[PDB]
Design a protein around this ligand. Structure first.
Ligand SMILES: O=S(=O)(NCc1ccc(S(=O)(=O)c2ccc(O)c(O)c2)cc1)c1ccc(O)c(O)c1
Ligand SMILES: O=S(=O)(NCc1ccc(S(=O)(=O)c2ccc(O)c(O)c2)cc1)c1ccc(O)c(O)c1
Ligand SMILES: O=P(O)(O)OC[C@H]1O[C@](O)(COP(=O)(O)O)[C@@H](O)[C@@H]1O
Ligand SMILES: O=P(O)(O)OC[C@H]1O[C@](O)(COP(=O)(O)O)[C@@H](O)[C@@H]1O
Ligand SMILES: O=P(O)(O)OC[C@H]1O[C@](O)(COP(=O)(O)O)[C@@H](O)[C@@H]1O
Ligand SMILES: O=P(O)(O)OC[C@H]1O[C@](O)(COP(=O)(O)O)[C@@H](O)[C@@H]1O
Ligand SMILES: O=C([O-])C(=O)[O-]
Ligand SMILES: O=C([O-])C(=O)[O-]
Ligand SMILES: O=C([O-])C(=O)[O-]
Ligand SMILES: O=C([O-])C(=O)[O-]
Ligand SMILES: [K+]
Ligand SMILES: [K+]
Ligand SMILES: [K+]
Ligand SMILES: [K+]
Ligand SMILES: [Mg+2]
Ligand SMILES: [Mg+2]
Ligand SMILES: [Mg+2]
Ligand SMILES: [Mg+2]
Lengths: 422, 425, 425, 436
């Protein structure tokens, strides 16, 4: 029964043609949904009661669109998101962190606009986790956003939105200085011919996957759901194909900000993403990602490939990783393991930000400390196991890969262990 | 000899990539398509696309197959639609550069237990009016196809039956349905109501993959550019859906309400044409050809052997086209199954085969009407030169280009066994 | 039949990985194809008798090597006359006649920097006595090949020059040497003294790989069956060395003292024949064909385009042979470079091209003696039928087999452009 | 180039020109062959073990010391000739020569002793002489048995029974010497510790022109199973009387290594020939060149794809460690092992990195020479009070021995493989360490 579920016959295929021929509508997904959902906050999704239903439906990142709305309005949206998120903190083994992303208005007819400088300052003061920087055309645009975040915003992730021809042509220099990319198809589809957007999307997703940096697919994914309870056949296909392309995150704009079915739109993206993730051809994908990732003498990089290889060898249910900044979890995610990457961290911000990386499931550690560092490490790993069991990630008899480091502090991951559950 | 500009166009850097990851990384929005659009467009006829003048604009925009939906309208209404399509098509017989065969497909109302009485009468109407194809609704098993075949009677055995898979049973019994059908339609409208909406992409990708393996035409249908029923431009999800259906391996793409009742029928056809051309250049031929080659069983049929040799030869010289002589369309279909980048120019005397080969990706039909030469070898040579001169006129070929030419050793269907490499003079 | 798929290592040939290919090799799977790697036998006191040469031709000798390091011009002229008498003793049966090339192996430069005066005289003797090939000793750079070519004069333009790589400089300047040579000999005797003995296998494997990439003949030479100079059976290392030279990709394998002075010249030829046939069936064609196609550059030459299409077609139908008409041998050489499993039966009127094509693996030359027919298409057909009749008599072909026939559109060399699938009747 | 650009800047262009690294990074086997370079010098320690047959030319203690220095890893005693007294003296001379280097534990080289049986002769199974010789083997503490003329699984069960309860730790390598042994290979390999392709008798039992097919098939199946395979007979035959081998002989040695043989053997070349030490040196020189010429890119991919999914943590850790070693061009993989099994599971994936196996078992240290690329280090210190400290001291002993022997340099990355509790069978940890 195990080998019939999660498209495993299609996963074991010798060719991509045979992989397609073996896809089965009766093969049910088993793994947890790995592609994060970004939902735009607006009149349809601002109330605390509404935000609780959206978190339960699968929202991982709340996007604030600063093109419209005053600072007072956005501060109230942030407070409502935080109230809804913290209403589930009473059960630490099931608590789900939710990131807050600030999407800038943009340069308009201008580099960095004066309104963007003020909005980025607001973002730092209100503790936002991510910035979706609008209309990024070159590396100096990213440097300007970084400077506007100041010394207190050094930890905020900058996701550059590629929205025009120049952004596509200067993609490599933009990606190099950004934490990730958003394929902002709305403006891109007006700036370049509509029939070419899929080429830009597939190229940018491919280059982000090669670089091991998060990539978001955005705009009109389930557009008809703004007024209708069910999406079109093209919309479900678009969501599935964005996941198959390699997108780390998928996004909802008007569907959740102003539409009549915000919760249903989140549920639909969750249902499609789970089905599409099981349909990924891991046999060729892992081989290509492994071959393309450069040779490295960084122990975190070396441990990550060894751990993902070990996970595939034993059909591991999960890779449990201890991380301070999220980096060790991101390096595991870049190889696209089928095994869930359960990231145990004490940092509330890193727990929110790792939603940008496909297949990273953040767990915020709030248990009492242990006097012996090795005992504290073991307890965090056992916490990952208990949370995994409660959430359905793990069962007794499963094998897990555990990734830790040799000393406290970030940057010292160098150990991979094979553990039997219970 | 060809120049650096040649190797920058039609996504050729992405085509030469050693891995699918590098293929994706090399896709370029500035690399313009050069080849003729190979995925056929099926447009549904209705109030928005019925007039002769509107049909002429749709043919110019790229419509290859006209679909008549027998779920609505009387036999009198459909006979007038067929006459209007034929009048619009024949209005171009004056210009060789613009005249093109256009197939007529009858889409049945559907089943109740066996074939409905209305379907028996509509299938009989199809034979009497010389339709080329039947899109059989709600096919659930092999006996459903046999019943449609029997209803095509003594005169309509040459009509192609494309089975529409619209429910769970059709998906589960897919292999037995494909075995007795000429091709398949992924009818996503009903399929998306019969099975969970989030599973339709799996059924679409599986059926396209299995049809490509079998070398039989597959159509992707329904809501591809839905918003264009009321808006002049489609959504980002809609352009993506069209591009991904082509990348999946669909031979044809379809428009329903977009052309039957919408406010922008011609613009919907133009949009599908523009996207398909871009998506066809983005196909990863290096791995696709290797996999189609490896999956296709060994064969002692000379047409199949010649087809793989010709497609291999076309890739070796970057041939502009493969010119094939065919009576039934079969030699062109066997070339098409290997997905050559070269256009398959099919020269035929059969007006029906010329219309029907639009079901096969990359087959460009040329109807030949010259009287037969007394010496057979001279009649073969005249048809090959007809394909070359048409190719020159339409922009496929230029003097100095190489073309692959596929013919047989004796007259009649079933004897294709020769591949030649010709330099265009 | 099931028996067909058990023979010639076909289970190991269909394997998905090289590891599985090795695991499926079967000592009970008998070879079926004709032996494709040519055997070069050095002529000497043990092999000069006309009657002994007849037995060597029957055992499988394809090329007779005359080592100009020993013996006078008078001795070598008698060797040539003896070889020709033995070869022509079989000319009375044209369907079974086996051409045999004559190769002159030069003494070399000695302590000099380039072409020695003795080599100038020996090369002139070679042209005057009509030798087919020159094995040029100690080639160190491209100018060494040019000097050999100049010494052959205007009458020796058709002689093939095979450069012997025997030292470090030859290995380092390999690319420039191969570019101007017709082929290469891995001359392991001197190479194993000029560079460390433990590195010779790296030079052999590299040079064979580069010659296969270039589509030019490569010969493996020296001590392959050394112990057979005095013993009736070779060592385990010797049989392994012959098998591995064929698996590496050598077009020819050579015997020196084993046929020139030893007590078992006929047995040494028979042993190389037996090993080569076993090793050729153990070649992993699945990966080899894919790599040769991928590495071979795109081409606008119709002979090259026809060759890849024909080899692809032969693999698709398990063709027993590819019958090719050739004037210079070039059309057969372009088929051979893709390493088909199908035998390349080359029909030619050129007695010299018939001898020289033994340098290309899997090319079986047939010398056609009939004067040209009045109708060129009939002359072409008679030559193809001669290939079929010779193939049937020699065991290459049987009724029911499929063959690929490669011809051109007009008389004269350089116009090959047609591939045809034919059933043997 | 982007996949190796940062590491090329860090390690230098000279590093990437050595050990056939351009040929190793090739995208196809054809390009791999085209890039093989006679000027690309081997760097890694020789991984294919050399078995030398002991006889009149290689019996003295002084001659045995030179053979150990030349690279002999396993001493073969051919019980087809010589009395029990003759073989006991050969064993004593080998042990005296081996123990003459024990004074420096960081450089000591273990040497296995293998007993090669006379065989069944005209009989259907285990002969009476073999029963007595196998009992002698157990009484004299031999590490390995090369069982002659194995034709079926019951032949190996008979050898195992003749070793008795005290010989359970002895490795049985079945010699395949006839058609029946080749046909029943799968059942023989299943119950054996490894195989010897005994080409001398095989080449008389089956057509001589078919032996290469049997050799390549058996090496392939042993590599698939992760069990040692030995290539034997006439590899450097002419070196019995000549100081240099023929071109076919060097080719045969190189091709046995490229085929996948864990061990290569010398018979008359060391037992009775005039150049026993030179024969060992020649096999050492060819094996190092051939090991660098292995196409690891495809070999590793095929070994991973063919190896079935496993829930054994030693197997899972082994593949993770070999993958990690390739990622960073690790100089070595240090593994703690009691029986040799954790080192054998690393060896089956054919890492380019040397597998430095630290063990307290003197017998396991000798037996792991059967597995390609395993370098045994015999640890002689008594156990620490705290087990985690004892584990750490053994890892440091591997690093210190590695540095002293030239395997490891400051700045290198090493992969360390250990287990979660004492005793055999619990390997489950892989660590990446920087050498300081
Ligand atoms: O156009 S193809 O050659 N696409 C191959 C293909 C498609 C997908 C994958 S992936 O899923 O491993 C993958 C996804 C993203 C990556 O960044 C990556 O490195 C690998 C591999 C290969 C094709 C189409 C239809 C066919 O029926 C056919 O046989 C061949
Ligand atoms: O015959 S081939 O298709 N390949 C042989 C090949 C391919 C790969 C390797 S391995 O060294 O990775 C390897 C060795 C042993 C194994 O158990 C294994 O799993 C892999 C060796 C040899 C060939 C020959 C010559 C060519 O020039 C050409 O392009 C192709
Ligand atoms: O992913 P990051 O940010 O590098 O964090 C990984 C770090 O986490 C640890 O596993 C545990 O460290 P702490 O005890 O400081 O939380 C370290 O050993 C390792 O260096
Ligand atoms: O594709 P089909 O229907 O088999 O037709 C291919 C046939 O066309 C030809 O090329 C020409 O035949 P006709 O002259 O009868 O049209 C035949 O030699 C060949 O058998
Ligand atoms: O291989 P080559 O030397 O180019 O010879 C091939 C030539 O042989 C032919 O098939 C027959 O030519 P001939 O009639 O002159 O022998 C030509 O059509 C073709 O050009
Ligand atoms: O390779 P083997 O025989 O399984 O030995 C591996 C064993 O060695 C160890 O690393 C150390 O064990 P000991 O302390 O008993 O020597 C164990 O943790 C592990 O199970
Ligand atoms: O700004 C955006 O999100 C867009 O244009 O898609
Ligand atoms: O009938 C159709 O085309 C459908 O249901 O999609
Ligand atoms: O000259 C030769 O043939 C050699 O050195 O091998
Ligand atoms: O016994 C042996 O070693 C042989 O026959 O090779
Ligand atoms: K915005
Ligand atoms: K209908
Ligand atoms: K000579
Ligand atoms: K013995
Ligand atoms: Mg925008
Ligand atoms: Mg329907
Ligand atoms: Mg020489
Ligand atoms: Mg023996």
């Amino acid at each position: 029964a195990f080998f019939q579920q999660q498209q495993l016959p299609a996963a074991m295929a010798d060719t991509f043609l045979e992989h397609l021929c073996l896809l089965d509508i009766d093969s049910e997904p088993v793994a947890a949904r790995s592609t994060s959902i970004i939902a735009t906050i607006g009149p349809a999704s601002r109330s605390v009661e509404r935000l609780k239903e959206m978190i339960k439906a699968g929202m991982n990142i709340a996007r604030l669109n600063f093109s419209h709305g005053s600072h007072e309005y956005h501060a109230e949206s942030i407070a409502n998101v935080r109230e809804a998120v913290e209403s589930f903190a009473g059960s630490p083994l099931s608590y789900r962190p939710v990131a807050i992303a600030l999407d800038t208005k943009g340069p308009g007819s201008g580099g960095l606009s004066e309104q963007d400088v003020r909005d980025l300052r607001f973002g730092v003061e209100h503790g936002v986790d991510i910035v979706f920087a609008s209309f990024v055309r070159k590396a100096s645009d990213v440097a300007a956003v970084r400077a506007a975040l100041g010394p207190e915003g050094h930890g905020i992730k900058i996701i550059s939105k590629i929205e025009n021809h120049e952004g596509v042509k200067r993609f490599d220099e933009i990606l190099e200085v950004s934490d990730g990319i958003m394929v902002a198809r709305g403006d891109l589809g007006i700036e370049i011919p509509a029939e070419k957007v899929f080429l830009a999307q597939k190229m940018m997703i491919g280059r982000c996957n090669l670089a091991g940096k998060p990539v978001v697919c955005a705009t009109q994914m389930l557009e008809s759901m703004i007024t209708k309870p069910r999406p079109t056949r093209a919309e479900t296909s678009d969501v599935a194909n964005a996941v198959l392309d390699g997108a780390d995150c998928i996004m909802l704009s008007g569907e959740t900000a102003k539409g009549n079915f915000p919760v249903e739109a989140v549920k639909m993206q969750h249902a499609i993403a789970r089905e599409a993730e099981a349909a990924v051809y891991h046999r060729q994908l892992f081989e290509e990602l492994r071959r393309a990732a450069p040779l490295s003498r960084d122990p975190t990089e070396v441990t990550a490939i060894g751990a993902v290889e070990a996970a595939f060898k034993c059909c591991a249910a999960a890779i449990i990783v201890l991380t301070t900044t999220g980096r060790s979890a991101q390096l595991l995610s870049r190889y696209r393991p089928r095994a869930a990457v359960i990231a145990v961290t004490r940092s509330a911000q890193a727990a929110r930000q790792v939603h940008l990386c496909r297949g990273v499931f953040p767990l915020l550690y709030r248990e009492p400390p242990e006097a012996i560092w090795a005992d504290d490490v073991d307890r965090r790993v056992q916490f990952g196991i208990e949370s995994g069991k409660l959430r359905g990630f793990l069962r007794v008899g499963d094998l897990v890969i555990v990734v830790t480091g040799w000393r406290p502090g970030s940057g010292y991951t160098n150990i991979m262990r094979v553990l039997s559950i219970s």
